Amino acid sequence: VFQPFSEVQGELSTVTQAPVTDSYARVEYHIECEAAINEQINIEYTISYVYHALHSYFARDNVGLPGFAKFFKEASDEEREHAHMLMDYQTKRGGRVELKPLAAPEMEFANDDKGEALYAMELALSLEKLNFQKLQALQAIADKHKDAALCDFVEGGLLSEQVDAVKEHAVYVSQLRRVGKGVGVYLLDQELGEE
Amino acid sequence: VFQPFSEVQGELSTVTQAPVTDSYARVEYHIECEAAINEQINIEYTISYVYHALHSYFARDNVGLPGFAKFFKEASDEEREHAHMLMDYQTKRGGRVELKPLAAPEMEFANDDKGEALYAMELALSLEKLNFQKLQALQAIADKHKDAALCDFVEGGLLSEQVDAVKEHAVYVSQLRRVGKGVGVYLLDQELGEE
Amino acid sequence: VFQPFSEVQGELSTVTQAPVTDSYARVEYHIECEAAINEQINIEYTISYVYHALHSYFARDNVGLPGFAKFFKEASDEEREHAHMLMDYQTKRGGRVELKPLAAPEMEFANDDKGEALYAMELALSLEKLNFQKLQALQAIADKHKDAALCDFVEGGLLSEQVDAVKEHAVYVSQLRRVGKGVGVYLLDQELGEE
Amino acid sequence: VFQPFSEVQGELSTVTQAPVTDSYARVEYHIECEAAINEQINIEYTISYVYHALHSYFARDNVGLPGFAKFFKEASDEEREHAHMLMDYQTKRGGRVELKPLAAPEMEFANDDKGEALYAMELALSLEKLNFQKLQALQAIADKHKDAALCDFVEGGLLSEQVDAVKEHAVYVSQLRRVGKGVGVYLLDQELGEE
Ligand SMILES: [Ca+2]
Ligand SMILES: [Ca+2]
Ligand SMILES: [Ca+2]
Ligand SMILES: [Ca+2]
Ligand SMILES: [Ca+2]
Ligand SMILES: [Ca+2]
Ligand SMILES: [Ca+2]
Ligand SMILES: [Ca+2]
Ligand SMILES: [Ca+2]
Ligand SMILES: [Ca+2]
Ligand SMILES: [Ca+2]
Ligand SMILES: [Ca+2]
Ligand SMILES: [Ca+2]
Ligand SMILES: [Ca+2]
Ligand SMILES: [Ca+2]
Ligand SMILES: [Ca+2]
């Protein structure tokens, strides 16, 4: 009742005829999904760039917060790797990566009310919450087109990780608020550095 | 087409204004979900307590089944850790843990028909099947409110583990039924002990 | 508000009364799901057998492609293990394994247009794409009956792996097409062998 | 004849009065130089992005050149690190990093005349020669304003490295031209991969 060689005729002729310009791998991988992944690639790639700008801010000699600087360089590396994993899945499924423009990020993060430390961490948290929702939207599209493979990929990977990321950033914010400017920031900068 | 600093304004003002009495992390985390997790926390916590009672029963000198006793102490530790993981996710997502009352468990497990061993294992199995359904219900709520992160968390963790747990308990029951009272129980108590 | 010993009465009487002819473990595990797993078992088992036939083809002294032969023996072992994992889940959930007939596979793979190497790899790819869809269908049934445990099992395991498998086979095809017959096939046979 | 405490009065009052909004480190570091470094940062950052696009192209299942893909991912990491070193020098000297927009890179690299391999390597070489001149221009500005520290930094670092890079890319091009399409590309893809 299972005749593999009759059943595979469809796929077989598809494969044997395909031009070298077509992905051979693509199976039930919707254009909208393909496009949503490119979108999310661009989102991670943008956030990586923003994080890199934050790094340069804390690297400034008069800011003197090299722990925060290290933290942001790493966050930048990490977000760029998030983009890379998405690209990897894209070509894994037969989709094609489209890389989009990156806008110039903000470079200035002085803030008299909150202090640049706390402000930057509040900005970061806010960005992470935003990306959590972006990730949620990405799986929604995946779910819409009933691509269970892509759902599993998104939710077990980035989505799940983003949860941890958000909580971690919430705590930093809570800490900066608790200890206040001056010594508190210096201490937290020390902590952020050994990580 | 992606302007992070315009797009983050919503999240940013939310974060910057929040009082220290609000979770900073909570994002699309429904009260009903938050409440269902507390419920399931209480269910694991209750089952841990019941398992602890079973342990004390088999610890009684005249019962003389220290392997079963060890087995139940471990099951009790394990269920309490299940509760702990749920609590961890709760505060991870910005939800708040509510711990509920624990009813006094049954302490007596003598049974003339089946023997206390077999009976206890049938009770345990029954409890595990029950909890499998509770877990199923927990993900249903998660699914209802389209919280893919929580679904992934529930199904890849406890739900999936509960499947293994149920099968493992089914086998014990099958074994006790096979070997019958006396030597069979003593042998299985030995097995349960080295685990 | 949680009385475990009242709530477990249903499950308890079910368990205590069950005959030794009934699975004790089965919980909300639909017959259609049980049957779909048997189907997918048969599909992996068939593909394993086909792969074994491919192996014997490349083992022929006049074909002289022992790397391709090794590759197919391994693919055959691997697909049979896929069947075994499905069987394992089946009895894990209380379902019963039904093993179905295996049709005689094709033994001949000479092909003048493409060459047997490329042809076999195109056949393999086609089979893998086919199985990707079969796997997709399997989770659809799981999803239909709202068995989140089985969904998680299917998508995190075989489904997700099948994605990698398809891409890997696409690349082989691309390579054979690139290097053409003769030395190209000999080189790829060498590569396939050290894997 | 050297009275440090009289001679340092200038620098001392400068330092003691400076607001926390000024770099404390900046010394004879011309705006034009500061701006040229930002420019060159953007150039490395752009080339990193382009290299990342090349990577995704060779990652496509139907292209099947994972060695070239690896090569470009690494080149992309490396160029981004070049940007990072420039940023590091910028804040080292008291200058401020300005990150600029990144244009969408080309994603398509099929080429019927030369083959995508050779074409991509010719593109890469061309890009590297271009960047060699950009680097030359960067030191010219440094030289113009007689900033010997920045000259030394530029010429001993990136400039000197870019020389090696250009020669290395010339050789790849020479090799692809020598071996031609098919097996030659497959062999070179193997070489590019183990690097
Ligand atoms: Ca999943
Ligand atoms: Ca799923
Ligand atoms: Ca997963
Ligand atoms: Ca992310
Ligand atoms: Ca999942
Ligand atoms: Ca899910
Ligand atoms: Ca998971
Ligand atoms: Ca549990
Ligand atoms: Ca899942
Ligand atoms: Ca699921
Ligand atoms: Ca999983
Ligand atoms: Ca499979
Ligand atoms: Ca010098
Ligand atoms: Ca010099
Ligand atoms: Ca030097
Ligand atoms: Ca360079």
Coordinates of N, CA, C and O and ligand atoms in Angstrom, one line a residue, chain A residues 155, chain B residues 139 151-152 155, chain C residues 139 143 147-153 155, ligand 10:
Chain A
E155 N 10.4 29.1 17.6 CA 10.0 29.2 19.0 C 11.0 28.5 19.9 O 11.2 29.0 21.0
Chain B
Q139 N -1.4 23.7 28.6 CA -0.9 24.1 27.3 C -2.1 24.7 26.5 O -2.0 25.6 25.6
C151 N 3.8 28.0 25.2 CA 3.5 26.7 24.7 C 4.7 25.9 24.5 O 4.8 24.7 25.0
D152 N 5.7 26.4 23.9 CA 7.0 25.8 23.7 C 7.6 25.4 25.0 O 8.1 24.2 25.2
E155 N 5.4 22.4 26.5 CA 5.4 21.1 25.8 C 6.8 20.5 25.7 O 6.9 19.2 25.8
Chain C
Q139 N 2.3 15.5 11.3 CA 2.0 16.4 12.4 C 0.6 17.1 12.2 O 0.0 17.5 13.2
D143 N -1.9 17.6 15.1 CA -2.4 19.0 15.4 C -4.0 18.9 15.4 O -4.6 19.5 16.2
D147 N -3.1 17.0 20.0 CA -2.2 16.3 20.9 C -0.9 17.0 20.9 O 0.0 16.7 20.1
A148 N -0.8 17.9 21.8 CA 0.4 18.8 21.8 C 1.7 18.0 22.0 O 2.8 18.3 21.5
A149 N 1.6 17.0 22.9 CA 2.8 16.1 23.2 C 3.3 15.5 21.9 O 4.5 15.5 21.7
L150 N 2.4 14.9 21.1 CA 2.8 14.2 19.9 C 3.4 15.2 18.9 O 4.3 15.0 18.1
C151 N 2.7 16.4 18.8 CA 3.2 17.5 17.9 C 4.7 17.8 18.2 O 5.5 17.8 17.3
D152 N 4.9 18.1 19.5 CA 6.2 18.5 20.0 C 7.2 17.4 19.6 O 8.3 17.6 19.1
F153 N 6.8 16.1 19.8 CA 7.6 15.0 19.5 C 8.0 14.9 18.0 O 9.2 14.7 17.7
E155 N 7.7 17.4 15.7 CA 8.4 18.5 15.0 C 9.8 18.8 15.5 O 10.6 19.2 14.7
Ligands
CA10 CA 3.4 22.2 19.5

